[PDB]
Enzyme design. Sequence first.
Site, short mmCIF file in Angstrom:
data_model
loop_
_atom_site.label_atom_id
_atom_site.label_comp_id
_atom_site.label_asym_id
_atom_site.label_seq_id
_atom_site.Cartn_x
_atom_site.Cartn_y
_atom_site.Cartn_z
N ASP A 108 -0.47 -7.09 -0.65
CA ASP A 108 -0.73 -5.83 -1.30
C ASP A 108 -0.97 -4.65 -0.35
OD1 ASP A 108 -1.62 -5.58 -4.57
OD2 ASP A 108 -1.87 -3.83 -3.25
N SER A 153 -0.07 -0.90 -7.55
CA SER A 153 -0.13 -2.29 -8.00
C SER A 153 0.37 -2.53 -9.42
CB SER A 153 -1.55 -2.84 -7.84
OG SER A 153 -1.93 -2.82 -6.47
N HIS A 202 -3.05 6.72 -12.23
CA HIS A 202 -3.80 6.43 -13.44
C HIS A 202 -3.71 7.54 -14.47
CE1 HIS A 202 -6.08 2.82 -12.22
NE2 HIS A 202 -5.87 3.30 -11.01
N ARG A 213 -8.99 8.77 -4.23
CA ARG A 213 -8.37 7.48 -3.91
C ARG A 213 -6.85 7.53 -4.03
NH1 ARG A 213 -10.74 2.33 -3.62
NH2 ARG A 213 -9.41 0.54 -4.17
N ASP A 214 -6.35 8.36 -4.95
CA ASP A 214 -4.90 8.53 -5.11
C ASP A 214 -4.50 9.85 -4.48
OD1 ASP A 214 -4.36 6.17 -6.60
OD2 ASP A 214 -5.27 7.12 -8.36
N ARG A 257 -14.79 8.12 -9.83
CA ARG A 257 -14.05 7.04 -10.48
C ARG A 257 -14.67 5.67 -10.19
NH1 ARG A 257 -8.09 6.67 -8.31
NH2 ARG A 257 -8.41 4.51 -9.03
N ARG A 304 -13.17 -1.77 -12.54
CA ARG A 304 -12.35 -2.85 -13.10
C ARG A 304 -12.88 -4.20 -12.64
NH1 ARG A 304 -7.12 -1.76 -9.17
NH2 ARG A 304 -7.99 -2.76 -7.29
N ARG A 332 -2.93 4.05 -17.24
CA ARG A 332 -2.92 2.74 -16.57
C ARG A 332 -4.14 2.03 -17.16
NH1 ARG A 332 -2.55 1.03 -10.14
NH2 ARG A 332 -4.07 -0.68 -10.34
N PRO A 333 -3.95 0.80 -17.66
CA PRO A 333 -5.05 0.06 -18.27
C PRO A 333 -6.17 -0.63 -17.51
CG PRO A 333 -3.14 -1.30 -18.33
CD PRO A 333 -2.68 0.05 -17.78
N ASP A 334 -5.90 -1.17 -16.32
CA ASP A 334 -6.94 -1.92 -15.63
C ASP A 334 -8.29 -1.23 -15.44
OD1 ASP A 334 -5.79 -0.31 -13.60
OD2 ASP A 334 -6.15 -1.82 -12.06
N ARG A 335 -8.29 0.05 -15.08
CA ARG A 335 -9.56 0.76 -14.87
C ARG A 335 -10.05 1.54 -16.09
NH1 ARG A 335 -11.49 0.59 -9.77
NH2 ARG A 335 -10.03 0.17 -8.04
N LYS A 360 -7.13 -8.00 -7.30
CA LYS A 360 -5.73 -8.04 -7.71
C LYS A 360 -5.42 -9.12 -8.73
CE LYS A 360 -4.79 -4.52 -5.20
NZ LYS A 360 -4.43 -3.19 -5.76
N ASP A 388 -4.33 -3.41 1.08
CA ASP A 388 -4.51 -2.33 0.13
C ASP A 388 -5.97 -1.95 -0.06
OD1 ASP A 388 -3.46 -0.62 -2.20
OD2 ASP A 388 -5.05 -1.83 -3.12
N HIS A 401 -7.61 1.59 1.44
CA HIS A 401 -8.09 2.69 0.62
C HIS A 401 -9.32 3.35 1.25
CE1 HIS A 401 -5.50 2.91 -2.85
NE2 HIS A 401 -5.58 1.61 -3.05
N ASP A 427 4.04 -4.92 -2.73
CA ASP A 427 4.29 -4.12 -3.92
C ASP A 427 4.38 -2.61 -3.70
OD1 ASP A 427 1.55 -4.19 -3.27
OD2 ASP A 427 0.94 -3.92 -5.36
N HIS A 428 3.92 -2.15 -2.54
CA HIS A 428 3.93 -0.73 -2.16
C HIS A 428 3.14 -0.62 -0.86
CE1 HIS A 428 -0.32 -0.47 -3.00
NE2 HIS A 428 -0.06 -1.20 -4.07
N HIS A 438 -1.88 5.52 -1.28
CA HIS A 438 -0.68 4.76 -0.99
C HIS A 438 0.33 5.59 -0.22
CE1 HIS A 438 -1.57 2.09 -4.77
NE2 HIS A 438 -2.45 1.93 -3.80
O1 LIG Z 1 -7.39 1.21 -7.09
C1 LIG Z 1 -6.55 1.58 -8.00
O2 LIG Z 1 -6.71 1.56 -9.26
C2 LIG Z 1 -5.24 2.11 -7.42
C3 LIG Z 1 -5.52 3.53 -6.96
O3 LIG Z 1 -5.89 4.44 -7.96
O4 LIG Z 1 -4.73 1.25 -6.37
P1 LIG Z 1 -3.85 -0.05 -6.69
O5 LIG Z 1 -2.60 0.41 -7.38
O6 LIG Z 1 -3.55 -0.71 -5.42
O7 LIG Z 1 -4.68 -0.93 -7.58
MN LIG Z 2 -0.82 -3.04 -4.83
MN LIG Z 3 -3.97 0.56 -3.79
#
Ligand SMILES: O=C(O)[C@@H](CO)OP(=O)(O)O
Ligand SMILES: [Mn+2]
Ligand SMILES: [Mn+2]
Length: 509
Positions: A11, A61, A122, A152-153, A184, A190, A260-263, A335, A402, A406, A443-444, A461
């Site tokens: 990652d 990711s 996100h 972060r982004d 954030r 997450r 984006r759903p994870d966070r 991850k 990754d 960050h 993945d990036h 990233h």
């Molecule tokens: O931490 C995250 O949510 C993103 C950055 O906003 O990074 P990554 O895509 O690697 O999860």
């Molecule tokens: Mn990633």
């Molecule tokens: Mn990242």
Amino acid sequence: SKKPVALIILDGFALRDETYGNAVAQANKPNFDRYWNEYPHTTLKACGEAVGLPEGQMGNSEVGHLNIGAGRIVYQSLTRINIAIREGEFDRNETFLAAMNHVKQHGTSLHLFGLLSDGGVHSHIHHLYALLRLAAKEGVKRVYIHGFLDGRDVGPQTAPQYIKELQEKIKEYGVGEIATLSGRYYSMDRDKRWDRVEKAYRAMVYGEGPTYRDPLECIEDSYKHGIYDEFVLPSVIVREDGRPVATIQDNDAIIFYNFRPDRAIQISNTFTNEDFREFDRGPKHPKHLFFVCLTHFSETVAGYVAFKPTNLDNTIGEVLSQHGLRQLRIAETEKYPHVTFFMSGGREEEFPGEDRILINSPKVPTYDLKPEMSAYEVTDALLKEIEADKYDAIILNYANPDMVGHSGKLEPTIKAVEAVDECLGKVVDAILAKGGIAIITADHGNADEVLTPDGKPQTAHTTNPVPVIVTKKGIKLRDGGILGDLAPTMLDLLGLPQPKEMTGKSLIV
Ligand SMILES: O=C(O)[C@@H](CO)OP(=O)(O)O
Ligand SMILES: [Mn+2]
Ligand SMILES: [Mn+2]
């Protein structure tokens, strides 16, 4: 026994010629280097249109794992929503309109919250502007913004520019008021760290947190204490009389403009779940909220989705399952959502024959404090599974490059990459020992640039291409490929038919 094919995702590990601030290049990677020199390799595009994103947009990711698992270019939410705005469909969204009709008919307030930046991973602040313009068009009088600061982004201390622009748009559109500002780290966790979520929640619902009349002074004060954007304590903007600009109350409407759903799941469940036990929200928490998620977050969220999801059929996990193969998904906390949910095409439920292993990430606030994270535990667990001859296919993710990258710190990220290289050698050698094949990729980018040219922290990233190494002698890999070509390559190695849905093409010549 079985000759496993293992897809290994490093990652945030990309290839960049410039070595300044490049932890990938500066790290001692004897294992990765030997595999690269001894086995067929190439690079893949992991950004922009190649992965379903707008031209020039860096990957991440979510985007990366979706494309890798799908074996096709997966159209992304950022692109979709940008097009809706471009084509005049955004303002016709039935869900946004229902939310606005709700507040107008019941005399309540509309709250807009999400990541305040143009990072595009996100959210995108232009989507917030579109919502403000829409609220004004529909005659909604009370609109409050709860900004989640980024860093972060985008740059770690860029919040002032986004706050200033938002203030200009608010004045121009004639609607909106900034109510709270929160890093954030708190509003978009997450990792199930509910103490963090609770802080953001209580600032928005109880008006509890550092108070300021001026949003810019809130940021400046935080900076003076060494606390930048990502980590800003949930703060409350107050009026001339000292009262909060706005707290979320019964019957209000909320539009969470993150796509984006994870966070987004944790804070969303906190607001909408009838039964919430993670923490006591308080006898007076808001009820009957008309909650809108920009995109699908989770079925557990009692709300409405503005841009409906579409199934991704025959992703790698489904093909493996259909053919009776046993597969393993493994990664540490950070991850885990990516090697499972996103890799499966945006599906939470495991496929028949799919096993999953979650390794707990270390209990540290930021990973530059423990660069090796839990890579050794992940490796130890996987080695035991490989030794057991149980899986035909393995999907492994090493989060370190990754996650530490960050932090925007060079030495820690170098250590992260070196730790992963040691683990990579053990895993790949074990796979080869079993007569299997490893597909080493990423993945990036991220770790390839952790410092800006001037030497300051680079916390986001990169758009650099990712490596691909297939540990099989006698073959050649074509150049010019994309992430969507990895699944077809894996099926090629497994000798399995490629479904029509996978429009990607095997990298093996
Ligand atoms: O931490 C995250 O949510 C993103 C950055 O906003 O990074 P990554 O895509 O690697 O999860
Ligand atoms: Mn990633
Ligand atoms: Mn990242």
